[PDB]
Design a protein around this ligand. Structure first.
Ligand SMILES: CCOc1cc2ncc(C#N)c(Nc3ccc(F)c(Cl)c3)c2cc1NC(=O)/C=C/CN(C)C
Ligand SMILES: CCOc1cc2ncc(C#N)c(Nc3ccc(F)c(Cl)c3)c2cc1NC(=O)/C=C/CN(C)C
Lengths: 306, 306
């Protein structure tokens, strides 16, 4: 019993974190096999970041300008290239701690764990979601760039996020491990604003199922609804529209609890229209949207990794 | 920017987790040097747990009855003893992944990270606090016993919690690594109820400082208070009394923000008396009490480990 915001164990990723310094800038890199991946803005001054021409800035850099350090030991850089917004630094030694891994570009609404690092050293681990506006709500200070987000399934680490930028409003933007930004964001210090922070409806429903499983059941009611009715309410409250695909994904939680998805939708509708009247659900006074259906099943079932 | 419920990186602890099976019961153990620590109730049936005589049950167990497996490899048990509510299984091989470590008995109000495990395999990591009533609000299923809680400072892992029991109300009880339960709880399946879940006042104040640092400042007001005045309010709302020791511990956050501790207390007083009027602080609609002053400084400053 109990339901917590839970991250994946981070050891497999800790063993891949290195420090990358180019001139005056230090950030973190990800060492997998004989390649270190890091944000291309390692090559910029803070002057450069207003309007950088990365191809021109890179011309002045050679292999020996990229100082890569794994713990106390220096790595020898034997090549470098730019791929979208990341650099790939080829080193002469394969990381002996390289786990089984994949690079995945996640969809908005999916969750992942972040290992926040500074100077190639781990500071902490927490759970995030790719928001519908393609930002994440992380915890990142100067020097955290190149920290990564990931999921684990049994023994395989799927890396999905590398941290690049903080917007003036305090939320975060980054790339996949191919160096393509999520959303419209760019690696320049400019006027870029986030769009509407829409709530991830299917995740809220999953968390209501988690609540029922764990004995929080005061919000269950005598009502049902339809997809189209419920979506009229979702729209008013800036929730994502619920689709039949979402209903299908909630099938397993519906079967476990015996609560039809549309009945749970009717509970959510009343919560949106009436609020929580000073009560809590799983220790929260708001409707939580950063647990996916798979996260709920996983945590409620004890799935393990390594 | 950003403030998240953040756990310590878990790799140092992942490398210590093993599976322990005694007869029909499997749970997790902690392998440090040549000793495996686990809950003594590994020796019980579910029959036995209503009224177990552990000394008598242990008489029927020999070294070869404790099956200890680290990943895919079996460990040879060369001795065993009971210390309070834990067993210490001496094995013939020191754990090559043993980190620098200490055993610490934490005080109520202090926080720690939990690595939830099943069958000796890590499932996830999350952050907890020792509540004033000596329970923790974790996420633990059958098979998670022997999972541990810990803090890290640079390279040293301070283990403070081993999981033993779930109370009928869904909260959790366990021991330190010497096998002494936190609070009055016992390792029998009996009528034991938790006392009042008091809110950790100094932690709420720390989190309000974290909020100010991160730009959430709507709750600041024109008022101040005194320790004795504020505590009249703390008492009504089942908050721990604030002491001068707590004020002193908040000194560094007071200095960073320029907000006197007692002025912040006056903000908290208004929040307790008026509620949050539908607003949020650091993404929460309630007053968060599981960040310590040290947690706030650490997360806001980027401290690292390994
Ligand atoms: C930790 C001990 O093992 C389990 C404990 C559980 N405790 C509670 C609930 C609940 N409720 C579980 N299952 C569950 C079901 C369906 C749901 F939708 C939800 Cl949320 C939860 C549990 C599942 C566990 N383990 C498995 O399911 C293992 C299966 C593996 N096979 C493919 C071979
Ligand atoms: C990640 C890059 O490094 C830092 C970034 C910071 N960003 C914001 C704030 C803020 N605000 C910080 N400090 C801080 C101060 C006092 C407070 F009370 C709070 Cl909460 C936060 C920061 C501290 C950092 N690093 C250090 O403090 C290192 C010192 C080590 N020496 C002993 C040698």
């Amino acid at each position: 019993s109990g339901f917590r915001k839970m991250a994946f164990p981070s050891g497999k990723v800790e063993g891949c974190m290195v420090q990358v310094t180019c001139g005056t800038t230090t950030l973190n890199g990800l060492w997998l096999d004989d390649v270190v991946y890091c944000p291309r803005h390692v090559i910029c001054t803070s002057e450069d970041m207003l309007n950088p021409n990365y191809e021109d800035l890179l011309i002045r850099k050679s292999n020996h300008n990229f100082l890569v350090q794994a713990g106390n030991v220096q790595l020898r850089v034997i090549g470098h290239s730019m791929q979208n917004c990341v650099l790939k630094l080829k080193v002469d030694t394969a990381n002996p701690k390289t786990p089984k891994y994949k690079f995945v570009r996640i969809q908005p609404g999916q969750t992942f764990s972040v290992l926040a690092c500074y100077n190639g050293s781990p500071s902490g681990v927490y759970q995030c979601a790719m928001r519908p506006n393609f930002t994440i709500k992380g915890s990142f200070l100067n020097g955290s760039c190149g920290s990564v987000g990931f999921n684990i399934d049994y023994d395989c680490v799927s890396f999905c996020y590398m941290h690049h930028m903080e917007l003036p409003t305090g939320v975060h933007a980054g790339t996949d491990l191919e160096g393509n930004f999520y959303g419209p964001f760019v690696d320049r210090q400019t006027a870029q604003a986030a769009g509407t922070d829409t709530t991830i409806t299917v995740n809220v429903l999953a968390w209501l199922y988690a609540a029922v499983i764990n004995g929080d059941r005061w919000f269950l009611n005598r009502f049902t609804t339809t997809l189209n009715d419920f979506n009229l309410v979702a729209m008013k409250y800036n929730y994502e529209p619920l689709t039949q695909d979402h209903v299908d994904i909630l099938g397993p939680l519906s079967a476990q609890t015996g609560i039809a998805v549309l009945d749970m939708c009717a509970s959510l509708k009343e919560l949106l229209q009436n609020g929580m009247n000073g009560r809590t659900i799983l220790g929260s006074a708001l409707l939580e949207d950063e647990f996916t259906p798979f996260d709920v099943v996983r945590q409620c079932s004890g799935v393990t990794f390594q």
